[PDB]
Amino acid sequence: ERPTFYRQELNKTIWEVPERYQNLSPVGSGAYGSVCAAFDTKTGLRVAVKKLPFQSIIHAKRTYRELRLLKHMKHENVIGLLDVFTPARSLEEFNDVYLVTHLMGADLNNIVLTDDHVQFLIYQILRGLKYIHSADIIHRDLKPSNLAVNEDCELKILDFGTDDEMTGYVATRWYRAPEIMLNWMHYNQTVDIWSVGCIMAELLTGRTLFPGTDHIDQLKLILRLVGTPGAELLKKISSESARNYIQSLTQMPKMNFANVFIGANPLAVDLLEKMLVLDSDKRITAAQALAHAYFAQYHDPDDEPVADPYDQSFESRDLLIDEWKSLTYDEVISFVPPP
């Protein structure tokens, strides 16, 4: 049965939410979008409520995409959907989408740690990533700011699935795999593993691994550590222009990671060497990384679940605004809360 909704001005828009949600207060000061913290009186959970959506074909498809992704994700280490609602009573008046998830304590930026803490945090990221990758979903933009923890350091991944904000000395680009940063090729799931390597290094040292002042400076930072590409990788760079530029660079050998990560657990150094490989074909996978000796005290093959199949055929589909809107409406209406 349809709950009673009440109205409140918050982020200079009128939020209309079910009575169960109380004490709504804006969080993140814009950083997360139009998001409010609230208390869910039905479940006793502190929740984050995001108000989004059908302004164009691209916007409507992106709205559908986000709802589909969030509805699929059912894993301890991945942000999932506690609720989704609209005050609209029919498809015709449907124009707002509200998404509800767990309210976390802080992101990984507001944390950066002992080796034991690093083990635990990276384990959880990899556990969540195994799940996400098993559904053929790539995050594409893993960074400390979309990794959040509660008070008990229990972690969840957020934001899975412009040129200006990627320009210059910016954290938005520091965690990106070189093949995606420079559009070398059609990339794979281990772009996310590169990101984990960058994050893990930063947890260990307290410092950004590749704090490039721009794309090129960052590539140079990367290649100084991992070496310039060999013949085999160059061949895989389908971008003739990008391949051409790479060959202009003075060749450099891979550095000794033990001399870069001075005093770190040798098993951590080993894992970093396996994650921070230039050739994405040869990077360690999430499933493989979980079985690495570094996570011996946390690893449990019976407690690292995979995802149900995820149908993303809609991605190659071209539809009208009202069609994406109708699809989105169906998904809102059919939502079943978690047990």
Ligand X SMILES: Cc1ccccc1-c1n[nH]c2nc(Oc3ccc(F)cc3F)ncc12
Residue 30 marked as a ligand binder = yes
Integer Rg of the chain from CA: 22
116 carries an active-site annotation: no
Tokens of 289: 């990384």
Binding of ligand X at residue 73 (CB under 6 A)? no
Q: HEC string of 68-92?
A: HHHHHCCECCECCCCEEECCCCCCC
Stretch touching ligand X by CB under 6 A, among 44-52, 117-125, 163-171, 200-208: 44-52
CB of 176 to ligand X, least distance (A): 20
Q: How far apart are CA 54 and CA 13, in angstroms?
A: 17
Compute the half-sphere exposure of residue 50: CA atoms within 13 Å on the CB side of its CA.
22
Binding of ligand X at residue 67 (CB under 6 A)? no
CB 262 within 8 A of CB 206: no
Helix axes 266-275, 191-205, angle to 10 degrees: 150
Instruction: Characterise 30 by phi-psi region: left (phi > 0), alpha (psi -120 to 50), beta (else).
Output: left
Residue 35 marked as a ligand binder = yes
Stretch touching ligand X by CB under 6 A, among 9-17, 48-56, 164-172, 248-256: 48-56
Residue 161 marked as a ligand binder = no
Q: How far apart are CA 196 and CA 202, in angstroms?
A: 10
> Which one, 155 or 268, has the nearer CB to ligand X?
155
Tokens of 18: 């079910």
> Which one, 159 or 217, has the nearer CB to ligand X?
159
With CB under 6 A as the contact rule, the residue among 24, 67, 81, 135 that binds ligand X is 81
CB of 274 to ligand X, least distance (A): 28
CB of 97 to ligand X, least distance (A): 10
CB of 224 to ligand X, least distance (A): 32
Question: By C-alpha distance, which of 328, 309, 330 is closest to 320?
Answer: 328
The residue from 96, 115, 159, 270 that is catalytic is: 159
Residue 32 marked as a ligand binder = yes
With CB under 6 A as the contact rule, the residue among 17, 73, 103, 204 that binds ligand X is 103
Residue 254 marked as a ligand binder = no
Binding of ligand X at residue 99 (CB under 6 A)? yes
Q: How far apart are CA 182 and CA 102, in angstroms?
A: 35
Per rule CB under 6 A, count of chain residues that contact ligand X: 20
Residue 33 marked as a ligand binder = yes
Residue list for the binding site for ATP? 27-35, 50
Active site residues: 159
